[PDB]
DNA sequence: TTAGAGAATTGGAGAGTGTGTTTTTTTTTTTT
DNA sequence: ACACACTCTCCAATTCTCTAA
């Protein structure tokens with residue numbers, strides 16, 4: 034009863050979080066000099082798409098606030114050390 | 121009560137083995153030929169004649185005449201189970217509703233949605249016609265024959281048989297078979313992903329996917 | 344200096360209760 | 376049998392406080 038879903042640290046370090054992020058951009062392409070605006074649009078498009086995988090309930094700005102707060106926890110640092118360099 | 125599985129096998133045996141000394145006595149097994157035509161989508165309705173059944177099993181005829189609705193469902197399922205055996209050919213795509221079904225198959229790879237045939241009984245020759253005054257309450261549920269004059273007829277209307285919905289978020293589809301004269305539609309997605317995440321996706325009904333049948337109303341009066 | 348555990352207050356997710364809902368006979372004025 | 380309006384409850388989210396890393 035009352036099994037309310039919410040985005041906590043264990044969910045954030047799951048596969049649809051940072052691992053999926055690490056792999057989403059290796060297929061993308063960017064145009065660079067004089068096209069930075071379009072590259073930003075493409076980047077944000079993929080980022081909103083990815084965020085919706087992780088927790089499809091919040092608006093994107095509210096989701097960013099949750100990630101900004103939740104980034105403080107040691108649990109995500111234990112995964113960050115793997116995402117940076119390698120496992 | 122009878123075991124309707126045994127009755128199903130008996131009905132299958134009738135369809136598989138009966139020949140009326142048919143096609144000028146050449147014994148070409150009328151219902152087998154009909155099943156070929158049905159499998160190749162040459163024909164839609166199939167009128168099973170109870171006089172043919174009486175040649176093998178009059179007790180089955182009596183079983184059908186009372187509580188006919190059970191045997192309607194039973195014969196329909198038997199025909200659906202036997203249909204692939206009389207198929208040999210691939211049929212051309214010719215209907216938008218079946219284009220949706222084809223897409224559904226392509227994506228997958230209830231039966232009511234696919235069951236594109238109709239099954240009806242032709243009354244036994246023993247049963248003389250009643251007048252509209254002699255169909256009293258002891259005949260509820262039983263197969264009857266009536267005689268009279270038509271007074272009024274409506275236009276042909278589309279009657280709903282099974283509804284098909286799509287979900288905005290998860291991209292899945294859902295089905296709802298209809299039997300009563302009224303129903304209540306669905307609203308919010310019951311699929312596990314939407315439910316577990318409580319994501320709140322809504323359901324949109326698709327007239328391109330759902331199944332409809334021709335329906336008409338009529339009145340008949342005493343001589 | 345930065346972060347986690349134990350205790351107190353409060354929002355709201357959810358359940359329960361009460362109630363509502365064409366077709367016939369007779370008269371009166373004015374047209375005939 | 377199927378919809379509003381109202382009352383009420385228990386579960387657990389948010390912050391205070393004390394503590395260790």
Ligand SMILES: [Zn+2]
Pocket residue numbers: 287288289290291292309310311314321
């Ligand atoms: Zn859904």
